[model samples]
Target: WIPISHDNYKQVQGPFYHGTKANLAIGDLLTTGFISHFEDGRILKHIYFSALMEPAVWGAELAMSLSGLEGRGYIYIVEPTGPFEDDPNLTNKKFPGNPTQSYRTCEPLRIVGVVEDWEGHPVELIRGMLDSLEDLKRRGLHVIE
Candidate 1:
């Protein structure tokens, strides 16, 4: 048994959390399929993990809602790279930034997270903060879905 923390009251209780391969962290880009296949027994081709952490799911839905990614944007999957290992879209190139994935959101979006003062920030919580920030969301072109 092992515990690592500042105070045991807040943190991921580990032997493992979510999965082993990717080593998820705050702001780490992940690939998910929520928008593509939500409720369809398969996830979409891309999404958020701290995540929008749907597949450990992966981001930028906020971009779509706010400024509008114009249905054409690219979120970088540039880190640890372990998550990209299995996707055929990667075409056997197994490394961080192996290839750019398509980011397109066709509907309203929401951010979800289980957060504490303790550890990493989930994507939803961060987006929520960003969505509410006076300097950012206040110039207010649109409300997030």
Candidate 2:
């Protein structure tokens, strides 16, 4: 596999977003080495975000649900302070190309704004996704990206 480094990667311009249950203010930096939302036992090597808002919505919803938080999660508009690459876990693994435009960075992602009124998925749809996650966990296939 060819490496997509900062020098050679194809760039996707973004008013990008990162979704999580944590309430963060503008100017906060989301960095790597924090506890992962999916896997509790490990720290992440890179923090992730997306150029597309839909994936951020999913990220917010799932993060909220998994944390047993009330109401909803947040979607912070972000800018990668350094270089990033396509998320290998989903870009080629799940589709023909980087349709999702998801990415990961080793450097901090600076929070610049928030999506205050973004709609989340249906309750039934969220429930179904959670069940699928549980199934994957049971099968020991819930690999963190």
Candidate 3:
């Protein structure tokens, strides 16, 4: 993880003018925030967080936190869905052809968080963030812009 600096924090948390690439790499997890220049230049941000830990560590942590074993685990990605609107395209949009299921075994590790600015104009951006998080969980790396 790169040390967090004022410049780094600003860049990682921006749709501001002069913000070029917005991303944050923390440990084995990465978070990103961005604004779409299209659609009247609407601002959007998304986070992709992941960590690979031993099955034992994951089980222990989950057991301590949740009070029971949740099982070996399968990959999960949660996208935002609301009553009126469906599928808000923010960051990490899912391809239609992509499989929603994981074929490989998933170990236990809790790496989770949201992507937002300090003022929080785009708090709803967390909707599609989990797709990228799952992608990173499955592939062990994510390419951010």
Identify the candidate with maximal TM-score: 2
lDDT of 3 by residue, 1-145 (tens): 2332223332232111111122222122212221122233442232221122222232223222232223322221212111111112312246432122111111111223323322212324432544444455355343222
Residue 28 in candidate 3 has what lDDT? Answer: 24
- Candidate 3: where is the Cα deviation over 4 Å? 1-117, 143-145
Against the true structure, what is every candidate's RMSD? 16.0, 4.4, 17.8
Give one digit per residue, the lDDT tens place, for model 1 in 91-130. Answer: 2355353132312222212322222222333557657645
Candidate 3, pairs of clashing residues: none
Give candidate 1 misplaced runs (Cα > 4 Å): 1-58, 80-136, 139-145
14-105, model 2: which lDDT tens digit per residue?
79988887777899887522323333565446777898998889878876775567887889999988888877766677676678777878
Error of 2 at 65 (Å): 1.2
- Scanning candidate 1 in windows of ten residues, the lowest lDDT window is 13-22
Candidate 1: lDDT of 18? Answer: 19
Question: Alpha carbon lDDT of residue 51, candidate 3?
Answer: 24
RMSD of 3: 17.8
TM-score of model 2 (CA atoms):
0.76
Error of 1 at 79 (Å): 3.1
TM for candidate 1 is: 0.21
> Which numbered prediction scores highest in lDDT against the true structure?
2
Clashes of each: 15, 0, 0
